[PDB]
Design a protein around this motif. Structure first.
Motif, PDB file in Angstrom:
ATOM      1  N   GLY A 118      -5.452 -12.028  11.196  1.00 56.26           N
ATOM      2  CA  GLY A 118      -4.854 -10.868  10.567  1.00 56.26           C
ATOM      3  C   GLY A 118      -5.504 -10.586   9.231  1.00 56.26           C
ATOM      4  O   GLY A 118      -6.027 -11.470   8.582  1.00 56.26           O
ATOM      5  N   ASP A 119      -5.407  -9.328   8.836  1.00 55.72           N
ATOM      6  CA  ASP A 119      -5.899  -8.895   7.496  1.00 55.72           C
ATOM      7  C   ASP A 119      -5.001  -7.738   7.164  1.00 55.72           C
ATOM      8  O   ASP A 119      -5.058  -6.685   7.835  1.00 55.72           O
ATOM      9  CB  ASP A 119      -7.327  -8.463   7.620  1.00 55.72           C
ATOM     10  N   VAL A 120      -4.138  -7.918   6.168  1.00 55.26           N
ATOM     11  CA  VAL A 120      -3.230  -6.833   5.720  1.00 55.26           C
ATOM     12  C   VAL A 120      -3.531  -6.580   4.265  1.00 55.26           C
ATOM     13  O   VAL A 120      -3.335  -7.423   3.428  1.00 55.26           O
ATOM     14  CB  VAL A 120      -1.735  -7.240   5.920  1.00 55.26           C
ATOM     15  N   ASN A 121      -4.024  -5.368   4.011  1.00 62.05           N
ATOM     16  CA  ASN A 121      -4.437  -4.976   2.642  1.00 62.05           C
ATOM     17  C   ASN A 121      -5.380  -6.033   2.038  1.00 62.05           C
ATOM     18  O   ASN A 121      -5.336  -6.338   0.855  1.00 62.05           O
ATOM     19  CB  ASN A 121      -3.243  -4.802   1.700  1.00 62.05           C
ATOM     20  N   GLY A 122      -6.235  -6.598   2.872  1.00 57.43           N
ATOM     21  CA  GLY A 122      -7.200  -7.606   2.446  1.00 57.43           C
ATOM     22  C   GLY A 122      -6.718  -9.030   2.350  1.00 57.43           C
ATOM     23  O   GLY A 122      -7.515  -9.946   2.102  1.00 57.43           O
TER      24      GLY A 122
ATOM     25  N   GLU B 258       2.149  -2.761  -2.674  1.00 55.17           N
ATOM     26  CA  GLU B 258       2.040  -4.224  -2.892  1.00 55.17           C
ATOM     27  C   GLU B 258       3.433  -4.778  -3.320  1.00 55.17           C
ATOM     28  O   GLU B 258       3.657  -5.985  -3.297  1.00 55.17           O
ATOM     29  CB  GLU B 258       0.805  -4.630  -3.804  1.00 55.17           C
ATOM     30  N   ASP B 259       4.354  -3.892  -3.655  1.00 47.73           N
ATOM     31  CA  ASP B 259       5.752  -4.240  -3.936  1.00 47.73           C
ATOM     32  C   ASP B 259       6.756  -3.517  -3.017  1.00 47.73           C
ATOM     33  O   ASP B 259       7.913  -3.324  -3.362  1.00 47.73           O
ATOM     34  CB  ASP B 259       6.068  -3.900  -5.389  1.00 47.73           C
ATOM     35  N   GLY B 260       6.300  -3.091  -1.840  1.00 48.54           N
ATOM     36  CA  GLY B 260       7.179  -2.621  -0.786  1.00 48.54           C
ATOM     37  C   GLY B 260       7.869  -3.759  -0.081  1.00 48.54           C
ATOM     38  O   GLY B 260       7.777  -4.919  -0.447  1.00 48.54           O
ATOM     39  N   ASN B 261       8.550  -3.406   1.004  1.00 50.40           N
ATOM     40  CA  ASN B 261       9.336  -4.390   1.710  1.00 50.40           C
ATOM     41  C   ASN B 261       8.521  -5.427   2.433  1.00 50.40           C
ATOM     42  O   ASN B 261       9.037  -6.523   2.717  1.00 50.40           O
ATOM     43  CB  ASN B 261      10.276  -3.692   2.707  1.00 50.40           C
ATOM     44  N   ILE B 262       7.277  -5.089   2.791  1.00 51.60           N
ATOM     45  CA  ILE B 262       6.407  -6.012   3.514  1.00 51.60           C
ATOM     46  C   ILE B 262       5.682  -6.944   2.552  1.00 51.60           C
ATOM     47  O   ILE B 262       5.943  -8.153   2.528  1.00 51.60           O
ATOM     48  CB  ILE B 262       5.467  -5.241   4.473  1.00 51.60           C
ATOM     49  N   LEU B 263       4.809  -6.377   1.730  1.00 55.11           N
ATOM     50  CA  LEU B 263       4.026  -7.243   0.840  1.00 55.11           C
ATOM     51  C   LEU B 263       4.912  -7.832  -0.262  1.00 55.11           C
ATOM     52  O   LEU B 263       4.545  -8.888  -0.813  1.00 55.11           O
ATOM     53  CB  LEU B 263       2.877  -6.506   0.225  1.00 55.11           C
ATOM     54  N   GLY B 264       6.063  -7.230  -0.522  1.00 50.61           N
ATOM     55  CA  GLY B 264       7.039  -7.776  -1.449  1.00 50.61           C
ATOM     56  C   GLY B 264       8.073  -8.708  -0.865  1.00 50.61           C
ATOM     57  O   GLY B 264       9.002  -9.146  -1.567  1.00 50.61           O
ATOM     58  N   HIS B 265       7.969  -8.994   0.450  1.00 50.59           N
ATOM     59  CA  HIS B 265       8.843  -9.952   1.120  1.00 50.59           C
ATOM     60  C   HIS B 265      10.332  -9.698   0.868  1.00 50.59           C
ATOM     61  O   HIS B 265      11.052 -10.577   0.428  1.00 50.59           O
ATOM     62  CB  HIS B 265       8.462 -11.388   0.680  1.00 50.59           C
ATOM     63  N   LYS B 266      10.747  -8.492   1.253  1.00 47.66           N
ATOM     64  CA  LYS B 266      12.125  -8.062   1.072  1.00 47.66           C
ATOM     65  C   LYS B 266      12.904  -8.009   2.362  1.00 47.66           C
ATOM     66  O   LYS B 266      14.033  -7.517   2.401  1.00 47.66           O
ATOM     67  CB  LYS B 266      12.220  -6.716   0.376  1.00 47.66           C
TER      68      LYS B 266
ATOM     69  N   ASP C  30       5.698   3.069   4.219  1.00 49.98           N
ATOM     70  CA  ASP C  30       4.795   1.984   3.888  1.00 49.98           C
ATOM     71  C   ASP C  30       3.544   2.032   4.754  1.00 49.98           C
ATOM     72  O   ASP C  30       3.202   3.093   5.307  1.00 49.98           O
ATOM     73  CB  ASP C  30       5.567   0.665   3.976  1.00 49.98           C
ATOM     74  N   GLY C  31       2.849   0.905   4.895  1.00 49.68           N
ATOM     75  CA  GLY C  31       1.630   0.811   5.623  1.00 49.68           C
ATOM     76  C   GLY C  31       1.744   0.767   7.140  1.00 49.68           C
ATOM     77  O   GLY C  31       2.868   0.953   7.697  1.00 49.68           O
ATOM     78  N   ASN C  32       0.638   0.520   7.804  1.00 48.37           N
ATOM     79  CA  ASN C  32       0.632   0.426   9.261  1.00 48.37           C
ATOM     80  C   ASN C  32      -0.174  -0.750   9.691  1.00 48.37           C
ATOM     81  O   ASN C  32      -1.158  -1.168   9.055  1.00 48.37           O
ATOM     82  CB  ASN C  32       0.126   1.682   9.970  1.00 48.37           C
ATOM     83  N   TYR C  33       0.259  -1.366  10.792  1.00 47.75           N
ATOM     84  CA  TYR C  33      -0.544  -2.356  11.471  1.00 47.75           C
ATOM     85  C   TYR C  33      -1.185  -1.733  12.699  1.00 47.75           C
ATOM     86  O   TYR C  33      -0.541  -0.907  13.359  1.00 47.75           O
ATOM     87  CB  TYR C  33       0.277  -3.525  12.056  1.00 47.75           C
ATOM     88  N   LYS C  34      -2.442  -2.088  12.992  1.00 47.20           N
ATOM     89  CA  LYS C  34      -3.085  -1.812  14.277  1.00 47.20           C
ATOM     90  C   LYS C  34      -3.444  -3.170  14.873  1.00 47.20           C
ATOM     91  O   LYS C  34      -4.014  -4.032  14.210  1.00 47.20           O
ATOM     92  CB  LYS C  34      -4.342  -0.958  14.098  1.00 47.20           C
TER      93      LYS C  34
ATOM     94  N   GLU D  17      -5.925  -9.545  17.341  1.00 49.74           N
ATOM     95  CA  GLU D  17      -6.466  -9.163  16.053  1.00 49.74           C
ATOM     96  C   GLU D  17      -5.530  -8.149  15.464  1.00 49.74           C
ATOM     97  O   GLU D  17      -5.130  -7.203  16.140  1.00 49.74           O
ATOM     98  CB  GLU D  17      -7.868  -8.549  16.239  1.00 49.74           C
ATOM     99  N   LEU D  18      -5.157  -8.321  14.179  1.00 51.31           N
ATOM    100  CA  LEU D  18      -4.220  -7.401  13.524  1.00 51.31           C
ATOM    101  C   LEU D  18      -4.841  -6.934  12.194  1.00 51.31           C
ATOM    102  O   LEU D  18      -5.331  -7.755  11.435  1.00 51.31           O
ATOM    103  CB  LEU D  18      -2.868  -8.116  13.263  1.00 51.31           C
ATOM    104  N   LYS D  19      -4.828  -5.641  11.980  1.00 48.40           N
ATOM    105  CA  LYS D  19      -5.357  -5.045  10.772  1.00 48.40           C
ATOM    106  C   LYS D  19      -4.246  -4.155  10.149  1.00 48.40           C
ATOM    107  O   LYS D  19      -3.686  -3.248  10.803  1.00 48.40           O
ATOM    108  CB  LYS D  19      -6.555  -4.206  11.140  1.00 48.40           C
ATOM    109  N   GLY D  20      -3.888  -4.447   8.913  1.00 42.17           N
ATOM    110  CA  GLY D  20      -2.884  -3.713   8.195  1.00 42.17           C
ATOM    111  C   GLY D  20      -3.515  -3.037   7.025  1.00 42.17           C
ATOM    112  O   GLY D  20      -4.227  -3.681   6.279  1.00 42.17           O
ATOM    113  N   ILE D  21      -3.190  -1.775   6.847  1.00 37.60           N
ATOM    114  CA  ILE D  21      -3.687  -1.018   5.687  1.00 37.60           C
ATOM    115  C   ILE D  21      -2.612  -0.124   5.095  1.00 37.60           C
ATOM    116  O   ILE D  21      -1.603   0.214   5.728  1.00 37.60           O
ATOM    117  CB  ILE D  21      -4.971  -0.184   6.051  1.00 37.60           C
ATOM    118  N   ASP D  22      -2.808   0.283   3.845  1.00 32.84           N
ATOM    119  CA  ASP D  22      -1.965   1.266   3.163  1.00 32.84           C
ATOM    120  C   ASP D  22      -0.573   0.748   2.831  1.00 32.84           C
ATOM    121  O   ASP D  22       0.373   1.532   2.531  1.00 32.84           O
ATOM    122  CB  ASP D  22      -1.945   2.580   3.890  1.00 32.84           C
ATOM    123  N   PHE D  23      -0.462  -0.562   2.682  1.00 29.47           N
ATOM    124  CA  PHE D  23       0.827  -1.121   2.251  1.00 29.47           C
ATOM    125  C   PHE D  23       0.992  -1.068   0.752  1.00 29.47           C
ATOM    126  O   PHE D  23      -0.004  -1.091  -0.014  1.00 29.47           O
ATOM    127  CB  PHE D  23       0.991  -2.565   2.751  1.00 29.47           C
TER     128      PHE D  23
END
Ligand code: BR
Ligand code: BR
Ligand code: BR
Length: 228
Positions: free
Chosen positions: A21-25, A130-138, A101-105, A122-128
């Motif tokens: 996986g790679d989400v926002n790098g 960085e303090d949303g519910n995903i990358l901010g672990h909410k 928020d962002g999207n996974y493909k 293979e998972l690619k996440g972009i456009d998240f």
């Protein structure tokens, strides 16, 4: 008669899952193992983040982490695309749009390697955010029940699937994840192209009290319905 694909699932089947996986790098890898019992629509799996801390919430990966294990009622056997593609397998692709928020493909190859059913993703996440519910672990470590809607895509010799997941946020609200999916066989042989129907999911997330790595234990039941 019982098809070859069906026959491969009549007992308990070991499962191996491998995800890069790679989400926002933020790059990460997950391995999973367990077993599937399609007669009961039952999945039991344990996932480990092999690269350290998972950079997204485990619940956001539940849908990505083997629909060939769905219990199809006898009367709906002719509508089970997933097993009909076995053992050569199928490729599954999704786009998962997290609302606001962002999207996974994702791209998964699901096939047998010997007696093991393998889900390689293979998972690619972009456009998240960085303090949303995903990358901010909410998001809460729990999971709701949902229906997944399946239709044929003759032109692709496969199926199209859509559904909405609602993830509970720690403040009592909902993070919607809108899923769009396609599946196509890997082999050149015939598959079962279904009439419209759905799968009914329930999922329970837990932890292994002796496991110190970042992980998720998943118990899932999946039953096909909608045609009677
Ligand atoms: Br989590
Ligand atoms: Br996928
Ligand atoms: Br849960």
């Amino acid at each position: 008669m019982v098809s070859k694909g069906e026959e491969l699932f009549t007992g308990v089947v070991p499962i191996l899952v491998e995800l890069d996986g790679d989400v926002n790098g933020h790059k990460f890898s997950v391995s999973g193992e367990g077993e599937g019992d399609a007669t009961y629509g039952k999945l039991t799996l344990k996932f480990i983040c092999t690269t350290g801390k998972l950079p997204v919430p485990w619940p956001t990966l539940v849908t990505t982490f083997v629909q060939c294990f769905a219990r199809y009622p006898d009367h709906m056997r002719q509508h089970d695309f997933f097993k009909s593609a076995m053992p050569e397998g199928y490729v599954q692709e999704r786009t998962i749009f997290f609302k606001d928020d962002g999207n996974y493909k994702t791209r998964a190859e699901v096939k047998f390697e010997g007696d093991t059913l393998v889900n390689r993703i293979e998972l690619k996440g972009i456009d998240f955010k960085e303090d949303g519910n995903i990358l901010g672990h909410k998001l809460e470590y729990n999971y709701n029940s949902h229906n997944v809607y399946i239709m044929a895509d003759k032109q692709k010799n496969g199926i199209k699937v859509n559904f909405k997941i609602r993830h509970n946020i720690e403040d009592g609200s909902v993070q919607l994840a809108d899923h769009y999916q396609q599946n196509t066989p890997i082999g050149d042989g015939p598959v079962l192209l279904p009439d419209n129907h759905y799968l009914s999911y329930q999922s329970a997330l837990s932890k292994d009290p002796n496991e110190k790595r970042d992980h998720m234990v998943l118990l899932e039941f999946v039953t096909a319905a909608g045609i009677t």
